[PDB]
Design a protein around this ligand. Structure first.
Ligand SMILES: Nc1nc2c(ncn2[C@@H]2O[C@H](COP(=O)(O)OP(=O)(O)OP(=O)(O)O)[C@@H](O)[C@H]2O)c(=O)[nH]1
Ligand SMILES: Nc1nc2c(ncn2[C@@H]2O[C@H](COP(=O)(O)OP(=O)(O)OP(=O)(O)O)[C@@H](O)[C@H]2O)c(=O)[nH]1
Ligand SMILES: [Mg+2]
Ligand SMILES: [Mg+2]
Lengths: 135, 96, 447, 230, 331, 244
RNA sequence: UUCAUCUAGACAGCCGGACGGUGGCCAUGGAAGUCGGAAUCCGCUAAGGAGUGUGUAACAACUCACCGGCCGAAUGAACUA
RNA sequence: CUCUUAAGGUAGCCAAAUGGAUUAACGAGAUUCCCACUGUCCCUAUCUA
RNA sequence: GCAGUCAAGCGUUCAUAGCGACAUUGCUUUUUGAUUCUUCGAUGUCGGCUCUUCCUAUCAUACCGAAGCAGAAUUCGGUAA
C-alpha cells in the first residue's frame, strides 16, 4: 500500500470487478468501471473486490472525451453496503461512489460532492482536504 | 496430469477421525508444567455455559488506531458456583 | 539521462552458454520414451528448441535496452563517452549483439518447422541437437564484444551526474595550480590531494547553495600547451567540459614558486585556450599567493600579466588555500557574474515574466477602514528561552519521558494530569455519563 | 560515488584487519576442498566438474612444455606475405533406403478409406518454375519446408567451403525414380554453380557449373553438405 | 580500445583547431535541442506516466486476417495458381492494395503473372474510375469490374483475357488462377458472376470465405478463391482497418467514438439525404437527432447511442452512403 | 521562525494539527514525536492538547477557531467536548455547531479579525461564527475555488493563496482581509497551501520537503523572523525568476 | 615398474646473499625487472632472469628462480594393478 | 509489325417512374450483438410437500 | 553436420600401417543497437473443468557464497519440497 496513512482495518467488500460507480469529484467524468483492485489476495475463482477507502483501477464509461480509453487510479469513498463501525453500529450510504486520483494518492479535481466516509478520509490525507462533508 | 492450477486443501487432517466424542465432558490432556517454589493452588475449574451478551470497554493499547477510543464486543458468561473437594489421587512414574 | 547506473549485467560467452543451457534442462521435462506417440515425441523437442531460443533472445534484449544509445542523448555526454569508450567500438559491439539476436531467432524459427515432419525419436533428437548446437556456435563468437561491454557497463555506472543546463562554475588550469584544493574548500568531496601533475584523471563534481539557489562546481584534470593535435584522452575531458557547458570559468594561476612554472608559458596556454571563452565570462584568479604577493612582480612580468586584461572581459582577484576566508568572495563574485547573464537571458523570453507575475508580486490592502487590527503575541513567549538540543539542563521534552519509561508503542501517556480544575486532587476522576436511561451530560449544567 | 571510490577508500583506510590471513587460509583449504568436491557432486555436476578438471590439466601440460622449449630454441610475394587465410567418388556404397520409409501414406475422404496419396519425407530440389499441381490430380506430395535451394560445398584441396546454389540432381543412388523426383539423400550427386570460386579452363573459358557429392543425411539436420568433384 | 590494457591515448582524429571545434559544438547543441522541441509537439506520454494512468489493451477483433491459419492458405493458393489476380476496392484502392506480397511474388515466383482487378465500380463516378484505371495501368494490366450475376460489367473482358493466358501455356493441360485481396472486396462475387450461378457463398459480413475452393470453367482453366488477408503493418491506425471494411462492427466496444471519422470522410450534403436529416454539428448531436427521429429510445426515454452508431458504420461500409477517395491528379 | 517537521511520514501538517495564537491541538496516533516537535518550539508558553474529533486523527479539517473561541462539528462526542473544555482555559469559548458542511477547517478560513466562508454555509452558522470568534464574515471563493479554508493560509500578518489565483482576485481579497497576499506553494510544489502548514503571529510549521525558495516566501510574507517586512521580496525577485 | 638427488649433507623448515653497465632501447603526462612492443646481450661470481608475484602516480619495500649457513638419512617424479 | 491506357473534380450522358438479386411478408430453419433481467457466478444459507 | 589443422596417449613392438581425447579454423547474407511487415502442407489427436497425492530438475518465503556489492534495487550459485 503506497500513499496511504497507516494500517487499514477490514470492512465488508461490496463492489467486485465489473461494477460501475459514480464520480464524485468534478474532473469531468460521470461514472467509473472497476477492473482491478490494488492490494488484493489470490484464490481460485475469487473475484477481486473493493470496499470503502480502497484504491482501484478504472476506466471512464461516460464523461469527458479527453478522459476515456485510459485506465486510471481511483479511491472508493461511498459504498451502499452495510458495514460495521467500532462504536458499534452498522451503516450504509445511498450509492457507490469514488474519485479519480494518482498513484501517490493526490486528487485530480478540486472539490468532492456529498458525504465521505471517515474510513477513507482518515486513510488518504488529500481526500480529507477536498471533502467538504465527512460522513 | 498435474491439476493445472494449485489450490489449498479442504479441511484439516489433524482433527481426524471426525467421530463422536466419548463423553459429554471433555477431558484435560495437559496441565501447566510445575514449580515447587510456589504456593499450592488449583489449575482448572468446572462451569456451565450460559449465553452471550455485549460489552463496551475503554481501550488502552499504545500503537493501535483505537488507543483512547471505545470498542463494542461480545462476551460469554459461564456460571460457576463453588466446587467441593472429595478426594485425592497419587500417580507413580513408570517407564511406561 | 543523467547517470545510467541500472544496466543489468553481462556475462561472458562461456558462462552465458551455461546459464541458458542449464535453464532449459532444469525448467523443461526430461524423460521421453520411444513407445509414446509420435505427436508427443515431436512436441517434446519443439519445446526444447523454443525455450532455449527465448532464453538467448531475452538475454540479448536486456543489453540492447540498457545501454544509453550514444547517438541523440546530448552533445556533451556524447563527446565525453566518445573520448572515454571509443564511439566506433561502442556502436560496433552493440550491432554485433543485435545481429546475433536476429540470427538466433531465425534458427529457432526454422528448426521447429523441420521438427514437425520428423518420423522417429532418433531423427527428432538429432534435429534438436543440431538447433541447439548452431545456437551455441552463434553465441561463442561474441567472446570479444561481451567482454568489452562488461567493462564499459561497470565504468559507466560510476560516472558523475553532470547536468548541462544548470548553474555551473568550471575550475581549470595547469597541473598543480590549486583547483582541486579550491573545489575541496568550497564543496565537500573526496579528491586525492597529493602534489604531482596528474593526481586526477577525470572530472569531479560538487554542489553548494548560494542565495537560496543550487550551484555545481566542476574540477577538470588540466591541459598542457601541446599544439592541439597531440593531446590525450585526458585533456579532451577538460576541453569538452569548457566547450559544452554554459558556466563561469575560474582560471587559476600559480604565480608562485612551488611548481612555479614559466608565466610566459601559462599566459600562452591561456591565450591558446582563449577561443573556448566565447561567452563564458571568465575570471582569472591568482592562487598560492601567501608566499609571493604579486604586487612585488617585475615590470616585464607585469606586462605579461597585463596581456590578459585586453580580452573582452576578465576580472582579476587573488587568494590562497591557507587564509580560507577571502576565498568565499571569489565564488560569490563568480556566482553574481553567472546570475547576471542567467536573469537577463530568462527575461529575454518575455512570456515567462507575464505568467510568473503571480508569484513575485504582493497585493496591498488599500486599508478600507480605520479599525485597528494589530498582531497579538503573549508574554509567556517573549519570556521563553531557546531549546538547545545539547545543553546539560534544558526542557524535558515529553518524548524523552516516552523513550525512558518506556518505548514508542509501549508507553501509555496519561491524557489527564495536563489540565486545569478548581482542585488538582480530583483530576484522576470518572464522569458517569449514564443513569437508568438518562444520559447524564444532558441534565448536567450549573444552576 | 562518481569515480574509483572503492580504490580510493582502500588507499585511504584499507580493506580490513583480518583480510590477508583469511585469504591466505582460504588458499590453503583450497586443495582440501577441491578433492572433497570430486567425491561428492553427484549427477551431472560430477561430469561438468571432471571435464574442466581434465581440460585444466591439459592446459598446464601445454604451458609447461612450451616454457621448457623456450630455453634452448612457401615463397609468397611481398604483398601476399604479412597476410593470412582413378575416377572413383569419395562415397561409394552408402546404406540403402527402402520405399517404406521416405514415403508416407495420406488418407482421404470423410471416413478416411481412399488413401492413394504419398508424401516424401526427405529433402528435395524441386526445380525452377515449380507451380504445384491441382489437389485432385496431385499424388506425390513434396512439402514446402523440405525444399532446398543451396548447399555448403567444399574444395578437397584449397581448404575452403562456400554456399553455392544447386542447379540439378544429376544422379541419386538406389533408384532412378528418386533421381527424377529430385531427392537429396546421402551419396547423391548434384550440380552446383561455382562462379564464386573463379575457375578458368584451358582455352580461357569460365567454368560456372560442376558436380559435387552430398556427404551427410540432411534429414537429421538442415544443411546440405557437399564435396566438390575435382 | 578500453580495459585493463587499453593501449590508446589520443582521440580520433585530432580535430584541426579549437576555432572550428567550438563552431561544430555550438551548432550541434542547437541542432540537438530543436529536435526535442519538435518531438515534444509531435508527441507527451511522460505526463501520462506522472498521472500514473495508461492506455487500455487493444481489442482482438482488430487482428484479422492475420493469424497464420489463413496465411497458410495464402501461400498454398499462390503455389498452386498459375496466374494471380489482386482485387481492389474502387472507393479507396490504395488502402486495400496490400503491396507486401508483390515483393514476394516478384522475388520467389517470377513466372506467375499477377494482374489487377478493380471492382465495385458502380459506387464511384465514371471519371474517378477511369482515372484510377489509368493511374494503376503503369504497373500492371488492371481491368475494371462490377460483379453481379444478372447485371455485371467486365465479364467479357475478363473471359477473353483468361483465354489468352490459357493459349500461352498450350502445353500445361490446364491453368489455375487465384483471387486474392482484402476481406469484403468481392473475390467470391467475381467467381459467381463469371460462372453465372451461386457457386461460392457471399455475404456482407467480412469473414465469409474461410478455406480455399476449386471451381472449373472451360475444362482447361480453374479458379481458386481464398480468405481475405490484412498484412500485419505495425503502423497506420486502429481506425483505418475499420473504414476499410475488415472488422465485424458488432464487436467493437464503443462504436460512437468513430463517427467523427464518418463525418470527415463523407459529405454533409450526401449525409443529409439518407436519414433524412436535421441540421447539426458535433457528431454527438448528429447521433442524437438521428436516434430521436428513428425511435431508437432506451428504457425511458433517452436515445440509444451505440445501437445507432453500429448501423451508421454498417451503412457506411455496405454501400448505402456515397463516398470515395479522390484519384491522383493529372500530370 | 519557520520549522519543518512531519506527522508519521506525511507532510500535511495542517491536516493533523491546528495552531492558533493561544493554543495548539495535535493528533494522538503512535508516539510523542509530533507533540515534541511543538513542545521544542513553544515549551510551556501555550497549551498543547492531544485530541481527536469524532474518533479520527484529521483534527485540522474538522475544527475552526482563533484566540477567542473554537468551533467543533456535530459529530463530536460529549467525551471529547468535555476533554477540550477541561484542557483549555476559560478565556476561550467553545461551541459545537450543527452545519451540513461538517468540515469546518475546509469551510472557514479565519484569523483574529476576519473570516472567509464557503458560499453555501447557512445562516445559523454564519451568525454563530461572528458571535463566538468575534470576527467579520465574507462569503467568497479563491479564484473560483470552493473550500477557502484549505486553499489559503491566514495570519494577522499576511496570507498565502494557491498559485492559480488571479492577480485581480489577489487584489480584491487583500482589500477584504487587510493583509498582504502572495501565490506560492508548499511541500515541493503543492497547491493545497492551507492543508500543508500551520501558521500564526509568531510561528510557522511546514512539511519536510518545503524547499528553500518556498521557506523564504513563507518566512517573508508572514513576517516571521525579525525582520522580514514584506518588501524583502525585492531582494527575492531574482531567485523567484530563476525558480519559476 | 621405470628414472633421478644424496654424508664433496638429500627432502621440510628457519637465517644470510639476491650484484655491476643499468632508470638497457621504442614508446608518453607518468612506466626505474613487473600497463605495453622488439631483443633478450655483456661483466663479475658460490649464485643472482634486461625478471615469478605482491606494491607505488612514478620510486622505495617484501618475495621465488638460483646460491650459502643451522640440523642430520633417506627423498622426489612419472607410470601400471 | 495487320494490333490494344482515350474519359477529370462529390455524381455522367442516355434509355421508358426505374436502372433492381443489397428482393417485402412469413418461420418449432442456422447465426452475431444490444437494452432489460436475473443464484449463471463471487458463495452460499434457509423453507414446504 | 561436413571438410580440414593440431597432438597426450593407444595400437604386438610402430607415429608416419593406423586410430586418436582436449584445443582450433572454414560458412548459413549486409561490422555502426537500423526493423526484418516467413506467418509456407503436423493425416492424427488437445483442452478444461472437480478433487487428492507424489517427485525436484526451486518461481516466492528461511538461511548462506561470489560479484565495482557505497546505500537502494539486482545478477550468478549452495542447502532446502
Ligand atoms: N602551501 C600551499 N600550497 C598550495 C596552496 N594552494 C595549492 N597548493 C598546492 O597544491 C598542491 C595540490 O594540488 P592542487 O591544490 O589540488 O592543484 P592541482 O594539482 O592542479 O589540482 P588537480 O589537478 O585537480 O588535482 C599542494 O601540494 C600544494 O602544494 C596554498 O594555498 N598553500
Ligand atoms: N455495390 C456493389 N457491391 C458489391 C459488388 N460486388 C460485391 N458487392 C458486395 O460486397 C460483398 C462481397 O462479398 P464477397 O463477394 O464474399 O467478397 P469477399 O469477402 O472478398 O469474398 P470471400 O472470399 O467469399 O470472403 C457482398 O455483400 C456484395 O453484396 C459490386 O460490384 N457493387
Ligand atoms: Mg594532482
Ligand atoms: Mg470475405
Amino acid at each position: 500500500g503506497n500513499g496511504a496513512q497507516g494500517t487499514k482495518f477490514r470492512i465488508s467488500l461490496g463492489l467486485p470487478v465489473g461494477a460501475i460507480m459514480n464520480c464524485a469529484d468534478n474532473s469531468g467524468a460521470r461514472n467509473l468501471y472497476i477492473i482491478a483492485v490494488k492490494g488484493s489476495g489470490s484464490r481460485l475463482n475469487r473475484l477481486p473486490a473493493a470496499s470503502l477507502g480502497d484504491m482501484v483501477m478504472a476506466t471512464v464509461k461516460k464523461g469527458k472525451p479527453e478522459l476515456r480509453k485510459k485506465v486510471m487510479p481511483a479511491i472508493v469513498v461511498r459504498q451502499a453496503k452495510s458495514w460495521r463501525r467500532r462504536d458499534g453500529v452498522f451503516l450504509y450510504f445511498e450509492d457507490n461512489a469514488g474519485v479519480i486520483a494518482n498513484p501517490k494518492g493526490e486528487m485530480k479535481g478540486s472539490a468532492i460532492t456529498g458525504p465521505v466516509g471517515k474510513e477513507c478520509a482518515d486513510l488518504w490525507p488529500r481526500v480529507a482536504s477536498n471533502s467538504g462533508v465527512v460522513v | 496430469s498435474h491439476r493445472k492450477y494449485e489450490a489449498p486443501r479442504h479441511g484439516h487432517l489433524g482433527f481426524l477421525p471426525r467421530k463422536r466424542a466419548a463423553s459429554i465432558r471433555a477431558r484435560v490432556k495437559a496441565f501447566p508444567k510445575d514449580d515447587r517454589s510456589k504456593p499450592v493452588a488449583l489449575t482448572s475449574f468446572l462451569g456451565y455455559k450460559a449465553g452471550m451478551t455485549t460489552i463496551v470497554r475503554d481501550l488502552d493499547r499504545p500503537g493501535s488506531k483505537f488507543h483512547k477510543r471505545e470498542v463494542v464486543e461480545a462476551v460469554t458468561v459461564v456460571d460457576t458456583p463453588p466446587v467441593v473437594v472429595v478426594g485425592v489421587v497419587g500417580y507413580v512414574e513408570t517407564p511406561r | 539521462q543523467l547517470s545510467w547506473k541500472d544496466i543489468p549485467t553481462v556475462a561472458p560467452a562461456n558462462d552465458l552458454l551455461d546459464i541458458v543451457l542449464n535453464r532449459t534442462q532444469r525448467k523443461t521435462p526430461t524423460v521421453i520414451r520411444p513407445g509414446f506417440k509420435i505427436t508427443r515425441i515431436r512436441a517434446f523437442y519443439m519445446r526444447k528448441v523454443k525455450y532455449t531460443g527465448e532464453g538467448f533472445v531475452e538475454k540479448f534484449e536486456d543489453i540492447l535496452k540498457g545501454f544509453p544509445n550514444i547517438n541523440d542523448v546530448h552533445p556533451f555526454h556524447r563527446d565525453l563517452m566518445d573520448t572515454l569508450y571509443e564511439k566506433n567500438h561502442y556502436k560496433i559491439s552493440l550491432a554485433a549483439i543485435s545481429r546475433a539476436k536476429s540470427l538466433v531467432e531465425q534458427v529457432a524459427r526454422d528448426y521447429v518447422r523441420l521438427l514437425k515432419f520428423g518420423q522417429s525419436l532418433f531423427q527428432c533428437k538429432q534435429l534438436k541437437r543440431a538447433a541447439l548446437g548452431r545456437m551455441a556456435t552463434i553465441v561463442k563468437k561474441l567472446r570479444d564484444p561481451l567482454a568489452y561491454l562488461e567493462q564499459v557497463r561497470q565504468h559507466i555506472g560510476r560516472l558523475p551526474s553532470i547536468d548541462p543546463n544548470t548553474r555551473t562554475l568550471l575550475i581549470c588550469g595547469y597541473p598543480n595550480v590549486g583547483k582541486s584544493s579550491f573545489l575541496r574548500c568550497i564543496t565537500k568531496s573526496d579528491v586525492d590531494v597529493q602534489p604531482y601533475a596528474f593526481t586526477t584523471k577525470s572530472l569531479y563534481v560538487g554542489h553548494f547553495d548560494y542565495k537560496y539557489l543550487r550551484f555545481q562546481a566542476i574540477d577538470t584534470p588540466g591541459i598542457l600547451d601541446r599544439p592541439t593535435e597531440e593531446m590525450n584522452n585526458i585533456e579532451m575531458q577538460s576541453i569538452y567540459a569548457i566547450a559544452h557547458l554554459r558556466s563561469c570559468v575560474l582560471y587559476f594561476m600559480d604565480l608562485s614558486e612551488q611548481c612555479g612554472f614559466t608565466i610566459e608559458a601559462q599566459v600562452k596556454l591561456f591565450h591558446s585556450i582563449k577561443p573556448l571563452f566565447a561567452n563564458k565570462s571568465v575570471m582569472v584568479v591568482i592562487n598560492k599567493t601567501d608566499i609571493i604577493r604579486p604586487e612585488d612582480l617585475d615590470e616585464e612580468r607585469a606586462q605579461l600579466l597585463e596581456s590578459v586584461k585586453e580580452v573582452p572581459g576578465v576580472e582579476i582577484m587573488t587568494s590562497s588555500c591557507q587564509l580560507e576566508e577571502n576565498v568565499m568572495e571569489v565564488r560569490n563574485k563568480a556566482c553574481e557574474k553567472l546570475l547576471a547573464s542567467r536573469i537577463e537571458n530568462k527575461l529575454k523570453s518575455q512570456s515567462r515574466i507575464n505568467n510568473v507575475l503571480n508569484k513575485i508580486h504582493v497585493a496591498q490592502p488599500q486599508a478600507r477602514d480605520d479599525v485597528k487590527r494589530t498582531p497579538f503575541i503573549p508574554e509567556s513567549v517573549k519570556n521563553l528561552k531557546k531549546y538547545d538540543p545539547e545543553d546539560p539542563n534544558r526542557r524535558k521534552l515529553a518524548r524523552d519521558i516516552e523513550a525512558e519509561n518506556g518505548g514508542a508503542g509501549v508507553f501509555n501517556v496519561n491524557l489527564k494530569d495536563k489540565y486545569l480544575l478548581e482542585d488538582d486532587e480530583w483530576k484522576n476522576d470518572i464522569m458517569p455519563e449514564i443513569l437508568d436511561g438518562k444520559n447524564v451530560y444532558d441534565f448536567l449544567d450549573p444552576e | 560515488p562518481q569515480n574509483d571510490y572503492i580504490e580510493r577508500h582502500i588507499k585511504q583506510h584499507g580493506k580490513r584487519l583480518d583480510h590477508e590471513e583469511r585469504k591466505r587460509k582460504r588458499e590453503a583449504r583450497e586443495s582440501h576442498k577441491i578433492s572433497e568436491r570430486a567425491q561428492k557432486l553427484t549427477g551431472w555436476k560430477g561430469k561438468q566438474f571432471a571435464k574442466k578438471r581434465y581440460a585444466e590439466k591439459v592446459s598446464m601440460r601445454k604451458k609447461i612444455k612450451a616454457h621448457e622449449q623456450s630455453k634452448v630454441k612457401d615463397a609468397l610475394p611481398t604483398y601476399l606475405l604479412d597476410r593470412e587465410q582413378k575416377f572413383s567418388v569419395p562415397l561409394p556404397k552408402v546404406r540403402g533406403i527402402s520405399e517404406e520409409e521416405m514415403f508416407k501414406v495420406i488418407k482421404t475422404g470423410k471416413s478416411r478409406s481412399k488413401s492413394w496419396k504419398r508424401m516424401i519425407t526427405k529433402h528435395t530440389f524441386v526445380g525452377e518454375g515449380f507451380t504445384r499441381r491441382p489437389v485432385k490430380m496431385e499424388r506425390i506430395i513434396r512439402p514446402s519446408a523440405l525444399r532446398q535451394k543451396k548447399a555448403n560445398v567444399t574444395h578437397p584441396e584449397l581448404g575452403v567451403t562456400v554456399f553455392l546454389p544447386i542447379l540439378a540432381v544429376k544422379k541419386n543412388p538406389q533408384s532412378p525414380m528418386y533421381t527424377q523426383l529430385g531427392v537429396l539423400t546421402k551419396g547423391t550427386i548434384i550440380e552446383v554453380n561455382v562462379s564464386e570460386l573463379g575457375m578458368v579452363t584451358a582455352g580461357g573459358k569460365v567454368v560456372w557449373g560442376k558436380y559435387a557429392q552430398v556427404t551427410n543425411e540432411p534429414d537429421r539436420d538442415g544443411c546440405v553438405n557437399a564435396v566438390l568433384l575435382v | 580500445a578500453f580495459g585493463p590494457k587499453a593501449q590508446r591515448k589520443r582521440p580520433r582524429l585530432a580535430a584541426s583547431n579549437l576555432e572550428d571545434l567550438v563552431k561544430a559544438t555550438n551548432e550541434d547543441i542547437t541542432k540537438y535541442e530543436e529536435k526535442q522541441v519538435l518531438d515534444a509537439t509531435l508527441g507527451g506520454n511522460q505526463e501520462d506516466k506522472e498521472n500514473g494512468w495508461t492506455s487500455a489493451a487493444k481489442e482482438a477483433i482488430f487482428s484479422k486476417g492475420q493469424s497464420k491459419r489463413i496465411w497458410n492458405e495464402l501461400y498454398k493458393v499462390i503455389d498452386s495458381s498459375d496466374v494471380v489476380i489482386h482485387v481492389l476496392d474502387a472507393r479507396d484502392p490504395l488502402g486495400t492494395r496490400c503491396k507486401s506480397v508483390e515483393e514476394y511474388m516478384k522475388k520467389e515466383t517470377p513466372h506467375k503473372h499477377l494482374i489487377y482487378v478493380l471492382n465495385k465500380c458502380d459506387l464511384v463516378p465514371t471519371w474517378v474510375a477511369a482515372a484510377w484505371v489509368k493511374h494503376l495501368s503503369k504497373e500492371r494490366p488492371t481491368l475494371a469490374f462490377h460483379a453481379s450475376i444478372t447485371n455485371s460489367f467486365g465479364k467479357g473482358s475478363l473471359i477473353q483475357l483468361l483465354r489468352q493466358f490459357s493459349q500461352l501455356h498450350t502445353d500445361r493441360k490446364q491453368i489455375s488462377v487465384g483471387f486474392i485481396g482484402y476481406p469484403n472486396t468481392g473475390k467470391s462475387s467475381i467467381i459467381n458472376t463469371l460462372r453465372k450461378k451461386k457457386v461460392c457463398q457471399v455475404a456482407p459480413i467480412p469473414g465469409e470465405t474461410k478455406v480455399w475452393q476449386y471451381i472449373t470453367l472451360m475444362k482447361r482453366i480453374f479458379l481458386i478463391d481464398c480468405p481475405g488477408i490484412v498484412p500485419p503493418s505495425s503502423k497506420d491506425s486502429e481506425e483505418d482497418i475499420l473504414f476499410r471494411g475488415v472488422v465485424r462492427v458488432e464487436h467493437v466496444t464503443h462504436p460512437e467514438q468513430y463517427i467523427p471519422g464518418v463525418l470527415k470522410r463523407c459529405q454533409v450534403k450526401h449525409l443529409e439525404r439518407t436519414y433524412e436529416i436535421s441540421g447539426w454539428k458535433d457528431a454527438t448531436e448528429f447521433i442524437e437527432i438521428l436516434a430521436r427521429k428513428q425511435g431508437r429510445l432506451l428504457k425511458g426515454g433517452e436515445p440509444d447511442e451505440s445501437g445507432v452508431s453500429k448501423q451508421i458504420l454498417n451503412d457506411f461500409n455496405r454501400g448505402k452512403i456515397p463516398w470515395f477517395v479522390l484519384p491522383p491528379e493529372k500530370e | 521562525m519557520a520549522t519543518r517537521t512531519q506527522f508519521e511520514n506525511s507532510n500535511e501538517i495542517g491536516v493533523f494539527s491546528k495552531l492558533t495564537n493561544t493554543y495548539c491541538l495535535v493528533a494522538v496516533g503512535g508516539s510523542e514525536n509530533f507533540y515534541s516537535a511543538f513542545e521544542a518550539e513553544l515549551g510551556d508558553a501555550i497549551p498543547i492538547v492531544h485530541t481527536t474529533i469524532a474518533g479520527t486523527r484529521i483534527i485540522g479539517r474538522m475544527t475552526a477557531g482563533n484566540r477567542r473561541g473554537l468551533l467543533v462539528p456535530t459529530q463530536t462526542t460529549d467525551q471529547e467536548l468535555q476533554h477540550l473544555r477541561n484542557s483549555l482555559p476559560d478565556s476561550v469559548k467553545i461551541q459545537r455547531v450543527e452545519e451540513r458542511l461538517s468540515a469546518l477547517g475546509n469551510v472557514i478560513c479565519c484569523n483574529d479579525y476576519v473570516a472567509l466562508v464557503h458560499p453555501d454555509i447557512d445562516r445559523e452558522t454564519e451568525e454563530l461564527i461572528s458571535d463566538v470568534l468575534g470576527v467579520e464574515v465574507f462569503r467568497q471563493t479563491i479564484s473560483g475555488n470552493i473550500l477557502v479554508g484549505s486553499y489559503c493560509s491566514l495570519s494577522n500578518q499576511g496570507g498565502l493563496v494557491h498559485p492559480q489565483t488571479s492577480v485581480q482576485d489577489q487584489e480584491e481579497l487583500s482589500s477584504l482581509l487587510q493583509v498582504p497576499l502572495v501565490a506560492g506553494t508548499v511541500n515541493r510544489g503543492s497547491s493545497v497551501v492551507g492543508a500543508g502548514m500551520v501558521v500564526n503571529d509568531y510561528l510557522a510549521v511546514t512539511g519536510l520537503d518545503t524547499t528553500a525558495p518556498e521557506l523564504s516566501v513563507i518566512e517573508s510574507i508572514f513576517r516571521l523572523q525579525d525582520a522580514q517586512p514584506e518588501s524583502i521580496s525585492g531582494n527575492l525577485r531574482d531567485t523567484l525568476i530563476e525558480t519559476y
